[PDB]
Amino acid sequence: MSREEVESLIQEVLEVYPEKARKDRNKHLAVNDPAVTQSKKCIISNKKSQPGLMTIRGCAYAGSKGVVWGPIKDMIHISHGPVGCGQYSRAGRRNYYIGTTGVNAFVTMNFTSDFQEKDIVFGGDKKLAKLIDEVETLFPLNKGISVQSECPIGLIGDDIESVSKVKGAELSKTIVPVRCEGFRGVSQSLGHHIANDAVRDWVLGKRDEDTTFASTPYDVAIIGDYNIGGDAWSSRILLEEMGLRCVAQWSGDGSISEIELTPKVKLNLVHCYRSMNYISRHMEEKYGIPWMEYNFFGPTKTIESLRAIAAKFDESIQKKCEEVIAKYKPEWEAVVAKYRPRLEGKRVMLYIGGLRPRHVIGAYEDLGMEVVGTGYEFAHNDDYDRTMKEMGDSTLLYDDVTGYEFEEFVKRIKPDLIGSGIKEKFIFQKMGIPFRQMHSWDYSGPYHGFDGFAIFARDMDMTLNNPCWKKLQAPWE
Amino acid sequence: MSREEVESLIQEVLEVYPEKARKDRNKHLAVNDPAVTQSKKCIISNKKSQPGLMTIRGCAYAGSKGVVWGPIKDMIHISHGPVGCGQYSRAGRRNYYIGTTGVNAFVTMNFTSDFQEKDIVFGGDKKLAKLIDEVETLFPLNKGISVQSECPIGLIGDDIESVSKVKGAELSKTIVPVRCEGFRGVSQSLGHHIANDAVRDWVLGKRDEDTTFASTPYDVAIIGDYNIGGDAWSSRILLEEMGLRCVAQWSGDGSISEIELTPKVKLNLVHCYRSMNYISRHMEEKYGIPWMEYNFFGPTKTIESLRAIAAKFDESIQKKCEEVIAKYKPEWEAVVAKYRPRLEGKRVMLYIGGLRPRHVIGAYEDLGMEVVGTGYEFAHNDDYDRTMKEMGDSTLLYDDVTGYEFEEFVKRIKPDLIGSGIKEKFIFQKMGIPFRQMHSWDYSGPYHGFDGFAIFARDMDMTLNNPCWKKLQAPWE
Amino acid sequence: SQQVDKIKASYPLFLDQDYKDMLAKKRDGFEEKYPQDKIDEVFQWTTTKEYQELNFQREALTVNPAKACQPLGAVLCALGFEKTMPYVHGSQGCVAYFRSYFNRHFREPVSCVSDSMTEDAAVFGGQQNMKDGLQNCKATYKPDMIAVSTTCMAEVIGDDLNAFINNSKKEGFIPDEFPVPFAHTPSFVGSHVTGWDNMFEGIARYFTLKSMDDKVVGSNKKINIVPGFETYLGNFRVIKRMLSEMGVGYSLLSDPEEVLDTPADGQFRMYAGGTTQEEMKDAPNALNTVLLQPWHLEKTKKFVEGTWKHEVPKLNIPMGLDWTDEFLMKVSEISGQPIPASLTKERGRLVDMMTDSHTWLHGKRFALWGDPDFVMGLVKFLLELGCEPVHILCHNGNKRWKKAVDAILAASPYGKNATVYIGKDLWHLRSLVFTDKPDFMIGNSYGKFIQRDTLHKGKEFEVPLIRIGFPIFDRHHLHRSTTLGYEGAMQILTTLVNSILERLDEETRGMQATDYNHDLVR
Amino acid sequence: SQQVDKIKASYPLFLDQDYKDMLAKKRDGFEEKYPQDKIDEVFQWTTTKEYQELNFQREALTVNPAKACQPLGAVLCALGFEKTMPYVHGSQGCVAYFRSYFNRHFREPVSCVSDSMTEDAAVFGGQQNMKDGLQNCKATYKPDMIAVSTTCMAEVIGDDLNAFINNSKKEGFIPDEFPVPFAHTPSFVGSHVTGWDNMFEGIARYFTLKSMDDKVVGSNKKINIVPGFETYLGNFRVIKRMLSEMGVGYSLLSDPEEVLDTPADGQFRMYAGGTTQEEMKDAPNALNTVLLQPWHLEKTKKFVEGTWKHEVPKLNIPMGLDWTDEFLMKVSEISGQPIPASLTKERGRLVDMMTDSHTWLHGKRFALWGDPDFVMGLVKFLLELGCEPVHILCHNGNKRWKKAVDAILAASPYGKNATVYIGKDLWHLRSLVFTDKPDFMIGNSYGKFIQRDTLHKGKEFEVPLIRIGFPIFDRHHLHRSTTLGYEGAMQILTTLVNSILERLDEETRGMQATDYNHDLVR
Ligand code: CLF
Ligand code: CLF
Ligand SMILES: [Cl-]
Ligand SMILES: [Cl-]
Ligand SMILES: [Fe+2]
Ligand SMILES: [Fe+2]
Ligand SMILES: [Se]
Ligand SMILES: [Se]
C-alpha cells in the first residue's frame, strides 16, 4: 500500500467513532516517515485511553508487580488489596529463574492480603503488619519483602510507608512499599517508573559505603531483561564469553543482592529502555556509571551490540568479541540458510508493549521478512523516535490501538503473520492469519542472542507455514 | 432352598433343551449329599461338551501352553500353528515371575510360527527348524524351548518330535515337543496330562545321574501353584518360615533348573491336584518321593495344611510350625474381626476350572459366608469326590455348566456374590449381583496363605458391599 | 550453542554444560544464596505437622488462593447474553486481566471493555467515563446490550451506577431504550461466583421488575435454567441436550457456549448465540426456575422467588448419579414430561461403568478444591464411587455450605476420614497433602505446584494432579469436557480410574523390580 | 505380613524385606540364573542397530504380533445383526478365547457358541456337530439368525459348511426358513479383518443373491454403510449421527453398538439392537454402498459391485480433516442432501483446535501400528497436524496398501522421515524405537511392554505409549471413544497434545533442576 492508501485506511476506520473519540484516535495513528527524528510531529503517545474502546493496556500494578518487582526471586512480593490482581497475574509472565520455590525463591507464588470489606472500611495497615510477621514465620529464607499496592490502598488512605519503616526496623529486614495502584498513570508505564523509584529509595543504596565487593574493570549489569523463557541467560552467556562479568540481571532471575551490588559495576547495559531508563539515569547521576542501549534480537543486532559494548573496554575484550562472533557465525548462518527461504518476503504486523515492537524488527529482517505495521500499548515519544528509523517508509504506526482498529487494519493489510499478545491471538487465528505471541513467546524461547535466534526462526516458520492455514475454508463453500 | 426345590429347578431349566442335550445335561447336574463318597453315583464329568450350548471350557492348548508350560520363565514357548491362539492367550493369565523380560525371561511374550497357507499345505517342520535358529540368535539367554502344538499340527501330519530331537542335539538345547492340539480331549484337562508327560519325557530326567546337589532333610517342592498374583510366593514364605527349603515351584515363577532339581526333594506338596497329580504319581513311582495334597486358602485350611506338612518331618519343624501359626494368629484374627461382620451369612455361587470350586470354600466360611452352589469346567470324578464333603447338604453342583443353566440357576438362587471368570463377569453385574473373578483375582491378590487371606477378605467386601449395587433400579421405575 | 536440525528451547537448552556452569557462577558470585543444606532443612520443615499448625494459624496472609474477584464472574455471566458486551466501570488494568484469564482457559477471544477511570475520577467520580464509554462502546462494537459491572476503585469512590447510566440516557449518550443492566461487584466481598450472582440478578431485574403486571406463572410452559459460573462447554450442552430429549420447554439464562466456541473459518465473530433479551423479558411466565449452582445464586434466588413468584426447587447441582436422578425427576414433575427411555438407558450405562471400575476406585483417597457447588457435587460422586474425599477445600465456601457438605459426608461410610475446609488456600492444602497424604489431587492447574513440591520430598510422597475445575491453563481443550449429568459422571469416572491405572503402570514399570505387577489386563 | 488397616496387594507386598530376601534365596539357590552383568550386556545388545539388522532378517519366527485370526472378525461382524448368535463351526477352545478377548476390551458380555468338534470328527467330518449344534443353539438361546464361521481344525479337515447347513435343514434340525449365513474363515489366511470381510460377504449373499430380480438401484433412497471391524463405540455412533444431521437416509450394515453397551439395570440382555434382516434384504435398493474401511472389505466390494450393481465410491476411511470432508461431500453428491450448518461449524471447531494446538504438535515424531485403514487414517491426520509419523507398522498390511500409504507420505513434507512396514511385528517395532527414537508410540496395550523396555535403557530413552487401537485392556472405557469424523479428529488431537504436555510436565517437575520450564500456562 502507498502512503495515500494508508492515510485513507486510517480515515475509513475512524469513521465508526463518535466525534470526541475520532479526534483523539486520529492523533495516535500515523504513516511512518523514516526521515522524521521528532515523533512529536507525527504521533501522540502516553495519554489516557478513551473509554469503551477496548484498549489492550494494563495498569501500573502490572508494570510494577508483574514486570519489575515480581521476577526478583528471593524476595516475597505482596499483592496488597483484594484477591483479583494477584490471582490473574500469578505465573502469567515467563520471567524465568533458578531456585527452590516456596523455600528460597517465590516468583510463581501468589502472596496477598486478600482485602475484605472490613479492611476497606477500617484500613489494612494492621493486617499488613500481621501479614509480615506471618511471612517471616512461614518463609524464613526470604531476603526481603515488597508491598505492591492495588487500587484500594491509596484510595482509603493507608500508610504502607509507615508499616514498612516500622516493621523493617523491628525485623532488620528490607521491606519496600510500592505505590503502584492501578488508578495511577494510564498504563503499565507509570508502574515501571514507580517501581524504579522504589528500588532507588529502599534497596539500591544499602551498600553505598560498603567496599567489600572485589570489582574488576569488566563488571557490567544487564538492565531491563526479564528473562522471558530464559532470554537473559542466552544474553549473559555471550557477554561472559566476551570476557565481561555480569554482576546483575534486572530483574529476570534477579536476586536482591545482585541489585544491591549493581552500583559497583563499570557499565549498565540497557535492553528495555522503557522500563529501566529511570534507574539507569539515576545510577549515572549518583554513581557515575555510564549506560548504553543495546539489542540482542537476531544476529545482525546481536553482532552490532557485542561490538559496541566491547568498544567501551580494552583490546582484550574487543579480541574476545571477535572470537565470540566467529564461534556463532556458522550456527546463525545455518539457521538463516534453513529458514530464510521458507520466510522470504512474508509480511508481519506487530503490536506489543514498550520495546519489542521496534526491537525485533532486525530479527525479522534477518529472515527476509518485512514488518509492515507496528505499535505499542504504552510507549512514549522517545520510543517512537527510535522506531521511525527502524520501520520502512509508508508503514503503519499505532499507539494504544483499539481492538476495532487492529482488526480493521489487518483486514485491509492482510499480513502473513501477526505478533502480539494473548488477548489478540485467537481473534487473528480465526481470521486465518498465523499468529505468534510476542510477549510469552507462545511458551517457547528464548529469543535473545544467537541461541534465541534459532528458536525464533523455528517458531516463525512452524506457525506461518503450518498446514492448518490451508484448511479454514470448507471445500463445499 | 430344599433338595426338592433344587431338583425342581434342575428339571425346569432342562425343559429348554432338545431331547439329546436334555438327557446329557441331566447327568451333569446334581444336588449335593455329603454322605456320598462315590460321586460316580451322583454326577458325570470329563465328557464332551454338547454342541451349541455355550460351554465356558477352553482346549488342551490352554491347559498345556496357558497353564502348565507358559509360566516357566527362562524357557521360550512357541505357539506353533496359526496366529490366533498365541495372541488371545498372550499375558491373559497372571502367572507372576521375577525376570528381565525379552532378555532372560519370556513369559508375557508371544512367540509364534504364524502359519500361512503354504505351511498347512506343505508342513511346518522346516519353518519350525528355521524358527529355532532365529530364537537362538535373538534370545541367546533362553535356557530351553517348548513347542506348543495348535490344532493344525497333528491334523497335517507334521513331526515336531523329529525336529525337537534333531535341533536339540545340534544346539545342545532342551527343546520339548508338546502335542497339545486343541482337537485332543474335551477341555483344558487333557492339556495338563499331555504337558505333565512332556515334562517327564523331555526335562525331568536330565539330572538323574548327577550327585552334586547339596540335599537337606527339609527339601520340598510346591507342585501345582501357578503364582496367580503372587500366590506361590505368599505360600513359599510360610513353608520356609516353618524351616523347609522350597527347591522348586511348578510352575508359577518356575525355572527349568528348579524343575530338573525336583527329583532331589523329600516331599512334593500338591496344591492343584487336577493339573499335577500325573507328574506327582510319576515321581513317587520313579524316585520314591511321596506327595500330599494341601490347601492354603484361608486361615483354617492354611493352619491345617502347615500342621499336616510339618508332621512329615521332625520335632524341629513341628516346633517352627507352631511358631509360624502363633506369628500370624493376630494378623488373620484382625482380618476376620474387620470383615466377617460385613460378610456374615452372605451366599456365594462359584464356577471355576478344576480346583478352586472346592478349594476356596474354607476361606469363604472363615468370613461366615455360605457356598450354595459350585461347579467346574473340566473336573473329573475324583475332584467331585473331594467336593461333596466340602459342600453343604442340598447345595447345587454343576459340571461343564452351560451359559443358559448358570444364568437360570442364579435367577432362582439369588446369591449375594458370584465367583467365576471373565466370560461370566459382566453378565452377572448387569443382573445386579456382585461378581469377583476367581481365576484372575480381578487383578488383585495374592489369595494364598495368611497374607493372601487379608486381600481376599478386602476384595469380597469391597465388591459385595459396594455402593453401586443399590443403584441399578432408576428411582422413577 | 544450537545444532540447527535439533534446536533446543529453554528445556533442555539450559542443561547444556556451558549454561550450567554459567548459572553456577552467577549463583556463587552474586546471589548470596542460602547453602543447599539450609534450603533442604527448611523444605523438610515445610512438610511437617509442626509447620502445618503454624500454617493453619494464619489470620492476615493468604498464599496461593483458590478464588478470584467478583467482576470476573460478572463478565462471564454477561458473555452469555445475545450480542452483549461486558463492560466493567472502573480501572482498565482489571479488564486486561479478566480477558487474559479467560483467553488462557478457553483458548478463545474474550471481549470486554473498560471505561478507563483514572486517578482524576477520585475528585469528581466516573460519570463522564460512563457517558463517553457507553456511547463509544455502542458505536464501535455494535452490541445490542451492554452489561455493566465495577472494579474496586469505582466501589471505593462510591460511583452510583444506576444514576450514571440514567444520566447517560437523559443526556443522549445512548438511546433510552438501549438495554444497560448493571450490578455493583466489589472485589473485596465474596469471590468471582458472587459477581456472577450479582450480574445475573441485575440483568433479571432490568428486564422484569417494572413489567410484572402482565405475567402469569406457567403461561409459557417452559422451565428457566440458571447455570451460574460455568467454564465447561459440555455442561451448558449436556443440560440443553437432556431437556431436549425429554421434550421439556426451557430457557437457559446466560448461555455463552456459542461465543466461547466459534469456528476458525476465516472470520472473527465477536458475538455468537446467547440468551435473548426476550428470553429474560418472558422468564417470569415460566412454570418455575431451576438453579444449577444454588450455593452461589442466593441473590438470584431471592429475586426469582420474591418478584417472579417461582417456587424454586431445593435441588443440588446435577452431578453424580443421585443428584442427576433428582434433577430429572423434579424437571419431570414440573413439566409433566416423563423421563424418556434414552435417559434411562444412559443412566444404566453410567451404572454399568461404575460396576466395571469399582475395584480400582474403592478406597482411593482424594484432596480436592474448587467453587462450592462443584466441590460438593464432586464429593457426592466420589462417595457414590466408594472413594474417600479426605481433604475438601473451598476457599470461597461459607459456614452454611460446610454444614451441608459435613451432612453429606455423615450419610456415607466413605466420608469418615474427610474434613471440609473453608477460607483456606492452596498453601494450606499443600500441608495437608504432606501430613495426611492422599492418593491424588483433583483440582485446577495451580495444583501442579503442589505435585512438584510432593515429588521433591520423594517419588513415594508424590501426589499426582487430576485436572478438573477452573482455571486449566497447562492442558489443551479440557474446557470442552462435561462434569454435569450422567455424561459428566461418565467422563469423571473414566478420568479418575485411568489416572489410577496410569500411576499404577508408572509404579510397576521397573524391569525386574516392580514389573511383576505390570499387567496387560486391568 | 499384613497390617489390617492398610492391606497390600502384590504390589507393594512383595517389596517387603522378608519377601525380597526370600526371592533372592530362591534365585540363588535353585534358578541357576545368568549373572546380572550378562543380562545387562544382552539387554544393551537388543537395543542396537546390529541387533535390529538380525531382527529384521527373521523369516520363520514371529514375536509379539499385531494381528489376530479370521474368526475373531467373523464373530464381531455377526454380533452387529439383530438377535444374531455368532457360531464358530470347529473347536471350542477358540470360542473361549474370542469371547474373553472382546470381554476384556469392551468390559461387556460377548455371546458366541461352538459346535465342539473333537478329534473324532477327523474321520467323519463335523456334520453331526452342525446338526445338533444348530438345533441346540436355536432352542437354548433363541436367536433369530445364526451366523456361521470356522476354526482352523474345520478348515484343515475340509468341512463343507454349505452342504452341512443344507443337510441340517433337510433333516429337520432347524426350519428351512431360519437364516443361517456362513463363511469359511481360515486362521492361516490374512487376519481378523479378513474374517470380518468374509462373514459380511456371506451374510449379504445369504439375504440378496437369489432375490435380485425385483431390485432397482436407488429405489429406497438410502446409502448403505459397511463399517468393517470396528471396536470403538463412538465410531458407529458418529457415522449415524452425521448422516442423521444431514437428513441422509442410510442403513448401517453390522451395527453392534447396542449389544456392546447394554445398561446395568438388573437384567442381562443377550441381544440388543443391530442391523435387521429387513435392512439386509432391502440393501440392493440403496443408491449406493459406502465402505468405511475399504482395505479389508475387498471381497464385500466385489459382491456389492458385481451383484448389487452399486458403484462403490473410492473413499478413504473418514479420519482426519480431508478424508472426513471427502466422505461428507461424496454422501452429499449421492444423497442430494447439502452438508448442513451444524457439520460445517463442527469442522471449523476442529480447525480452531488445530490452530490452538499446532505449536506443541509441530514436528513431533510417532511410531504407530494397527489395522490398515486405521493406520492410514492416523498417518493422514498426523500429517495434517504437522507431525512426523516416522515408524508405520501394519502387521496385516499388504503391498498395494503400502504403496498407497507411501503416496500419502509423498504428498506432504511431514512424511519425509517416515517408513511403512508390512509383515513386521512389535518385536520389530521395539528395535525401531531404540535405533530411531520417536517422541511417542500410538498403539494398543501390547505397546506397554515396549515402553517398559525403553525406560530400562534410561528415562531419556523412554517412549511413552498413547493408547489408540485394539485391544486396549489396561485402561477402562476407552472403547467408548471416537476416531472417525471431526469428532474423532478432535478426540485424537486432544489426546495427542495433552500426552505431549503431560510428558513435558514430567520432564520439568524437578525442583531447582528443570522446573524453570514448569509453566502454569501452555
Ligand atoms: S487496575 Fe484487582 S482485578 Fe481489579 S476489581 Fe480490584 S481486585 Fe479485581 Fe490494576 S491494581 Fe488491580 S489489576 Fe485492576 S484492581 Fe487496580
Ligand atoms: S482349539 Fe487358534 S484361535 Fe482357533 S481358529 Fe485356529 S488360530 Fe484361531 Fe485351542 S489349539 Fe488354538 S485355541 Fe482353538 S485353534 Fe485349536
Ligand atoms: Cl509456585
Ligand atoms: Cl512382554
Ligand atoms: Fe480456540
Ligand atoms: Fe460393561
Ligand atoms: Se508454590
Ligand atoms: Se515383550
Residue numbers in the entry:
A (entry chain C), B (entry chain A): 4 to 480
C (entry chain D), D (entry chain B): 2 to 523
Sentences from the study reporting this entry:
The reduction of substrates by nitrogenase entails multiple cycles of association and dissociation between two component proteins for sequential transfer of electrons. In the transient complex, electrons are transferred from the [4Fe:4S]-cluster of the homodimeric Fe-protein to the MoFe-protein in a reaction requiring adenosine triphosphate (ATP) hydrolysis. The MoFe-protein, an (αβ)2 tetramer, contains two types of unique metal centers per catalytic αβ-unit: the P-cluster [8Fe:7S] and the FeMo-cofactor [7Fe:9S:C:Mo]-R-homocitrate. The P-cluster is the initial electron acceptor with subsequent transfer to the FeMo-cofactor, one of the most elaborate metalloclusters found in nature and the catalytic center of biological nitrogen reduction.
